[PDB]
Amino acid sequence: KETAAAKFERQHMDSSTSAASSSNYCNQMMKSRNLTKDRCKPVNTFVHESLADVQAVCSQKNVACKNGQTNCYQSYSTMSITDCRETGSSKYPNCAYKTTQANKHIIVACEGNPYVPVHFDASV
């Protein structure tokens, strides 16, 4: 099957753009990344950075994840992110999202060898 690391890339990475450029960004990306195939995923974050810079976070500040696990890491720098959140008009299969652009630190959970991000925990 798809690996956890690959799933993280598909769900969360967008190195092709520097920021969301319109209100339709989330609608388009949620669909194109197959995040709406079975249900409308309610929230998701995309990171507009190189993959290497995100993978490097697994070597940065070790913190507790929101659920208490201790394999989370916070980026030293802020990163360009887009938050996507379902709107009131969303109704499967026509899932609909609000796009919010921000610069925040990210928190990811890492696993494996090579030790890479597998879950997006939070932005702060």
PDB file of C-alpha atoms in Angstrom:
ATOM      1  CA  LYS A   1       0.000   0.000   0.000  1.00  0.00           C
ATOM      2  CA  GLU A   2       0.941   3.700   0.132  1.00  0.00           C
ATOM      3  CA  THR A   3       3.511   4.282   2.856  1.00  0.00           C
ATOM      4  CA  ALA A   4       2.897   6.637   5.747  1.00  0.00           C
ATOM      5  CA  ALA A   5       5.636   8.934   4.469  1.00  0.00           C
ATOM      6  CA  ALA A   6       4.097   9.051   0.988  1.00  0.00           C
ATOM      7  CA  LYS A   7       0.701   9.721   2.466  1.00  0.00           C
ATOM      8  CA  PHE A   8       2.134  12.682   4.366  1.00  0.00           C
ATOM      9  CA  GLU A   9       3.520  14.124   1.140  1.00  0.00           C
ATOM     10  CA  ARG A  10       0.233  13.659  -0.689  1.00  0.00           C
ATOM     11  CA  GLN A  11      -1.849  15.087   2.150  1.00  0.00           C
ATOM     12  CA  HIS A  12       0.356  17.956   3.247  1.00  0.00           C
ATOM     13  CA  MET A  13       3.086  19.060   0.832  1.00  0.00           C
ATOM     14  CA  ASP A  14       2.739  21.692  -1.866  1.00  0.00           C
ATOM     15  CA  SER A  15       6.247  22.754  -2.886  1.00  0.00           C
ATOM     16  CA  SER A  16       4.922  23.983  -6.266  1.00  0.00           C
ATOM     17  CA  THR A  17       3.424  27.186  -4.915  1.00  0.00           C
ATOM     18  CA  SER A  18       4.670  29.678  -2.382  1.00  0.00           C
ATOM     19  CA  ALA A  19       1.229  30.442  -0.889  1.00  0.00           C
ATOM     20  CA  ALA A  20      -2.441  29.975  -1.694  1.00  0.00           C
ATOM     21  CA  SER A  21      -3.299  32.451  -4.411  1.00  0.00           C
ATOM     22  CA  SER A  22      -7.079  32.417  -4.366  1.00  0.00           C
ATOM     23  CA  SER A  23     -10.037  31.410  -2.295  1.00  0.00           C
ATOM     24  CA  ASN A  24     -10.391  28.255  -4.433  1.00  0.00           C
ATOM     25  CA  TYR A  25      -7.022  26.792  -3.450  1.00  0.00           C
ATOM     26  CA  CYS A  26      -8.383  24.391  -0.853  1.00  0.00           C
ATOM     27  CA  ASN A  27     -11.314  23.246  -2.944  1.00  0.00           C
ATOM     28  CA  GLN A  28      -8.984  22.345  -5.773  1.00  0.00           C
ATOM     29  CA  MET A  29      -6.209  20.783  -3.688  1.00  0.00           C
ATOM     30  CA  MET A  30      -8.442  18.726  -1.423  1.00  0.00           C
ATOM     31  CA  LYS A  31     -10.007  17.167  -4.498  1.00  0.00           C
ATOM     32  CA  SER A  32      -6.829  16.725  -6.537  1.00  0.00           C
ATOM     33  CA  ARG A  33      -4.944  15.049  -3.665  1.00  0.00           C
ATOM     34  CA  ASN A  34      -7.784  12.524  -3.248  1.00  0.00           C
ATOM     35  CA  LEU A  35      -8.668  13.740   0.227  1.00  0.00           C
ATOM     36  CA  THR A  36     -12.385  13.861  -0.541  1.00  0.00           C
ATOM     37  CA  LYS A  37     -12.775  10.462  -2.187  1.00  0.00           C
ATOM     38  CA  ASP A  38     -14.589   8.669   0.627  1.00  0.00           C
ATOM     39  CA  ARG A  39     -15.746  11.564   2.776  1.00  0.00           C
ATOM     40  CA  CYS A  40     -15.091  15.259   3.196  1.00  0.00           C
ATOM     41  CA  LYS A  41     -11.978  15.443   5.357  1.00  0.00           C
ATOM     42  CA  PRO A  42     -12.910  18.281   7.746  1.00  0.00           C
ATOM     43  CA  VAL A  43      -9.555  20.012   8.167  1.00  0.00           C
ATOM     44  CA  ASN A  44      -6.190  19.796   6.440  1.00  0.00           C
ATOM     45  CA  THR A  45      -2.990  21.829   6.219  1.00  0.00           C
ATOM     46  CA  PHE A  46      -0.709  22.235   3.200  1.00  0.00           C
ATOM     47  CA  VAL A  47       2.914  23.303   3.593  1.00  0.00           C
ATOM     48  CA  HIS A  48       4.536  25.462   0.914  1.00  0.00           C
ATOM     49  CA  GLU A  49       8.161  24.537   1.504  1.00  0.00           C
ATOM     50  CA  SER A  50      10.659  22.118   0.061  1.00  0.00           C
ATOM     51  CA  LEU A  51      10.307  18.515   1.126  1.00  0.00           C
ATOM     52  CA  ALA A  52      13.831  18.557   2.505  1.00  0.00           C
ATOM     53  CA  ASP A  53      13.017  21.501   4.802  1.00  0.00           C
ATOM     54  CA  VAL A  54       9.976  19.704   6.174  1.00  0.00           C
ATOM     55  CA  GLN A  55      11.835  16.416   6.604  1.00  0.00           C
ATOM     56  CA  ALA A  56      14.507  18.337   8.516  1.00  0.00           C
ATOM     57  CA  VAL A  57      11.961  19.139  11.221  1.00  0.00           C
ATOM     58  CA  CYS A  58      12.448  15.586  12.525  1.00  0.00           C
ATOM     59  CA  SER A  59      15.873  16.789  13.720  1.00  0.00           C
ATOM     60  CA  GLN A  60      14.548  19.994  15.359  1.00  0.00           C
ATOM     61  CA  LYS A  61      12.791  20.658  18.661  1.00  0.00           C
ATOM     62  CA  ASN A  62      11.314  17.524  20.232  1.00  0.00           C
ATOM     63  CA  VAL A  63       7.895  18.216  21.791  1.00  0.00           C
ATOM     64  CA  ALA A  64       4.859  16.258  22.911  1.00  0.00           C
ATOM     65  CA  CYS A  65       2.195  15.734  20.309  1.00  0.00           C
ATOM     66  CA  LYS A  66      -1.301  16.887  21.119  1.00  0.00           C
ATOM     67  CA  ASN A  67      -2.255  13.313  22.117  1.00  0.00           C
ATOM     68  CA  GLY A  68       0.769  12.974  24.404  1.00  0.00           C
ATOM     69  CA  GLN A  69       3.082  10.938  22.197  1.00  0.00           C
ATOM     70  CA  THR A  70       6.677  12.043  22.288  1.00  0.00           C
ATOM     71  CA  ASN A  71       7.776  11.580  18.682  1.00  0.00           C
ATOM     72  CA  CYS A  72       6.701  15.091  17.659  1.00  0.00           C
ATOM     73  CA  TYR A  73       8.968  17.872  16.511  1.00  0.00           C
ATOM     74  CA  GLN A  74       8.455  21.592  16.120  1.00  0.00           C
ATOM     75  CA  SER A  75      10.132  23.590  13.392  1.00  0.00           C
ATOM     76  CA  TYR A  76      12.598  26.238  14.504  1.00  0.00           C
ATOM     77  CA  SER A  77      11.406  28.546  11.726  1.00  0.00           C
ATOM     78  CA  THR A  78       7.990  29.600  10.563  1.00  0.00           C
ATOM     79  CA  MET A  79       6.787  28.100   7.305  1.00  0.00           C
ATOM     80  CA  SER A  80       4.222  29.112   4.708  1.00  0.00           C
ATOM     81  CA  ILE A  81       1.075  27.094   5.305  1.00  0.00           C
ATOM     82  CA  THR A  82      -2.482  26.958   4.063  1.00  0.00           C
ATOM     83  CA  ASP A  83      -5.260  25.792   6.371  1.00  0.00           C
ATOM     84  CA  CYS A  84      -8.304  24.254   4.758  1.00  0.00           C
ATOM     85  CA  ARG A  85     -11.499  23.921   6.827  1.00  0.00           C
ATOM     86  CA  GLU A  86     -14.889  22.664   5.707  1.00  0.00           C
ATOM     87  CA  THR A  87     -17.568  25.283   5.261  1.00  0.00           C
ATOM     88  CA  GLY A  88     -21.192  25.135   6.157  1.00  0.00           C
ATOM     89  CA  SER A  89     -22.198  24.485   2.578  1.00  0.00           C
ATOM     90  CA  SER A  90     -19.963  21.418   2.196  1.00  0.00           C
ATOM     91  CA  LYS A  91     -21.931  18.284   1.369  1.00  0.00           C
ATOM     92  CA  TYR A  92     -20.309  15.113   0.072  1.00  0.00           C
ATOM     93  CA  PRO A  93     -19.375  14.631  -2.749  1.00  0.00           C
ATOM     94  CA  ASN A  94     -19.224  18.397  -3.218  1.00  0.00           C
ATOM     95  CA  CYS A  95     -16.879  19.074  -0.385  1.00  0.00           C
ATOM     96  CA  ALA A  96     -16.200  22.791   0.182  1.00  0.00           C
ATOM     97  CA  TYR A  97     -13.475  24.555   2.110  1.00  0.00           C
ATOM     98  CA  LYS A  98     -12.342  27.933   3.386  1.00  0.00           C
ATOM     99  CA  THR A  99      -8.730  28.765   2.537  1.00  0.00           C
ATOM    100  CA  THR A 100      -6.535  30.588   5.109  1.00  0.00           C
ATOM    101  CA  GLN A 101      -2.902  31.464   4.386  1.00  0.00           C
ATOM    102  CA  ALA A 102      -0.465  31.924   7.292  1.00  0.00           C
ATOM    103  CA  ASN A 103       3.136  31.714   8.398  1.00  0.00           C
ATOM    104  CA  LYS A 104       3.436  29.429  11.428  1.00  0.00           C
ATOM    105  CA  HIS A 105       5.714  26.873  13.015  1.00  0.00           C
ATOM    106  CA  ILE A 106       4.685  23.321  12.245  1.00  0.00           C
ATOM    107  CA  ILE A 107       4.600  20.279  14.505  1.00  0.00           C
ATOM    108  CA  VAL A 108       4.957  16.857  12.890  1.00  0.00           C
ATOM    109  CA  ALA A 109       5.275  13.282  14.161  1.00  0.00           C
ATOM    110  CA  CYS A 110       8.236  11.335  12.774  1.00  0.00           C
ATOM    111  CA  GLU A 111       8.870   7.619  12.343  1.00  0.00           C
ATOM    112  CA  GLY A 112      11.075   5.225  10.497  1.00  0.00           C
ATOM    113  CA  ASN A 113      14.554   4.916   9.098  1.00  0.00           C
ATOM    114  CA  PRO A 114      15.133   7.344   7.435  1.00  0.00           C
ATOM    115  CA  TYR A 115      13.271   9.237  10.163  1.00  0.00           C
ATOM    116  CA  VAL A 116      10.661  11.283   8.348  1.00  0.00           C
ATOM    117  CA  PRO A 117       7.343  13.044   8.946  1.00  0.00           C
ATOM    118  CA  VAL A 118       4.290  10.794   8.939  1.00  0.00           C
ATOM    119  CA  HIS A 119       1.646  12.965  10.608  1.00  0.00           C
ATOM    120  CA  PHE A 120       0.860  16.670  10.748  1.00  0.00           C
ATOM    121  CA  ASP A 121       0.021  17.499  14.331  1.00  0.00           C
ATOM    122  CA  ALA A 122      -0.464  21.274  14.625  1.00  0.00           C
ATOM    123  CA  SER A 123       0.644  24.723  13.596  1.00  0.00           C
ATOM    124  CA  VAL A 124       1.608  27.288  16.247  1.00  0.00           C
TER     125      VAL A 124
END
